[PDB]
Design an enzyme around this catalytic site. Structure first.
Site, short mmCIF file in Angstrom:
data_model
loop_
_atom_site.label_atom_id
_atom_site.label_comp_id
_atom_site.label_asym_id
_atom_site.label_seq_id
_atom_site.Cartn_x
_atom_site.Cartn_y
_atom_site.Cartn_z
N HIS A 47 -6.62 -5.76 -2.41
CA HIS A 47 -5.43 -5.13 -1.83
C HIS A 47 -4.53 -6.04 -0.99
CE1 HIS A 47 -3.22 -1.47 -1.00
NE2 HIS A 47 -3.31 -1.65 0.30
N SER A 61 0.84 -1.20 0.00
CA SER A 61 0.00 0.00 0.00
C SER A 61 0.88 1.25 0.00
CB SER A 61 -0.93 -0.04 1.23
OG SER A 61 -1.96 0.93 1.17
N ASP A 121 -8.17 -4.40 -6.57
CA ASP A 121 -7.36 -3.65 -5.60
C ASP A 121 -7.78 -2.18 -5.49
OD1 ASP A 121 -3.76 -3.89 -4.92
OD2 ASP A 121 -5.32 -2.74 -3.91
#
EC number: 3.4.11.5
Length: 290
Positions: A268, A102, A241
């Site tokens: 994700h 991330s 995602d």
């Protein structure tokens, strides 16, 4: 159980967990990222220790178990100097691998640009080189949401009513669709998310939620600098995602020789939706570049 400690890195005390493998064929450093404000949701990568890959986990400043520095130090550049001080303190002049998830991926990209000489390889999962591009792309996701949830976001979101019941409901749906799809949210994930709503860094740097960025890094963009990264790079991103594969594509094009992998049916936190395959893809990458 691995080794845990509380060391003073770059001024403040940071928590870290070093999971050594019987035979240390390589070292891997990990960087968490919003919405997960801790290393907890990355513990699934501990399995790699069975492939001779040592894994280092730690809570970045103002996150998880680590103490919070001054607000003027809530920057990516600061996070870079912190990582380098920790790596040096634990591994000396040894070259290690760096994985980023991330916003931790954006941090890994910034780190690599200045300290790639200390890395044998780079791994970016659901990362990003531009926040404006990530926000633009996440706005498209909102419109793709079913009317009910989409109208709740736009309406109560335009007036800043984040406490709205229907607004909170939409957010939960959005996450269960672009954060961790068709899967039972493990304790490690709930823990990392809990830290976000307890500390301050998240709210200050990022904002209310993933698609609502108003923090100090909303303008962060080093797309015109990542091309300087010239080491083996692996990029992973999910089909659904929250950080769209279009964002990953941008990174893949600036970094020569990088590998791009889009995991179908995943979002994700791909390390929980495809734990075996994910860990097997990373370990194979690591072992090929010792």
């Amino acid at each position: 159980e691995c080794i845990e400690n509380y060391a003073k890195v770059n001024g403040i005390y940071i928590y870290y967990k070093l999971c050594k493998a019987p035979e240390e064929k390589a070292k891997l450093m990990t960087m968490h990222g919003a919405p997960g404000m801790s290393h907890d949701y990355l513990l699934s990568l501990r399995d790699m220790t069975k492939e001779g890959i040592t894994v280092l986990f730690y809570d970045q400043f103002g996150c998880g178990r680590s103490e919070e520095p001054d607000q003027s130090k809530f920057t990516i550049d600061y996070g870079v100097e912190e990582a380098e001080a920790l790596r040096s303190k634990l591994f000396g002049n040894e070259k290690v691998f760096l994985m980023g998830s991330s916003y931790g991926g954006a941090l890994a990209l910034a780190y690599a640009v200045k300290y790639q000489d200390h890395l044998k390889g780079l791994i970016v999962s659901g990362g990003l080189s531009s926040v404006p591009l990530t926000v633009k792309e996440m706005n498209r996701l909102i419109d793709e949401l079913p009317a009910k949830y989409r109208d709740a976001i736009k309406k109560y979101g335009s007036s800043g009513s984040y406490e709205n019941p229907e607004y909170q409901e939409a957010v939960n749906y959005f996450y269960h669709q672009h954060l961790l799809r068709s899967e039972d949210w493990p304790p490690e994930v709930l823990k990392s998310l809990e830290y976000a709503e307890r500390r301050n860094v998240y709210r200050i740097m990022n904002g209310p939620n993933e698609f609502t960025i108003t923090g100090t890094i909303k303008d962060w963009d080093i797309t015109d600098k990542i091309s300087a990264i010239k080491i083996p790079t692996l990029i992973t991103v999910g089909e659904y995602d929250e950080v769209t594969p279009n964002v990953a594509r941008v990174i893949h094009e600036k970094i020569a020789g990088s590998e791009l992998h889009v995991f179908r049916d995943c979002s994700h936190l791909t390390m929980w939706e495809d734990r075996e395959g994910y860990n097997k893809l990373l370990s194979d990458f690591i072992l090929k570049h010792l």
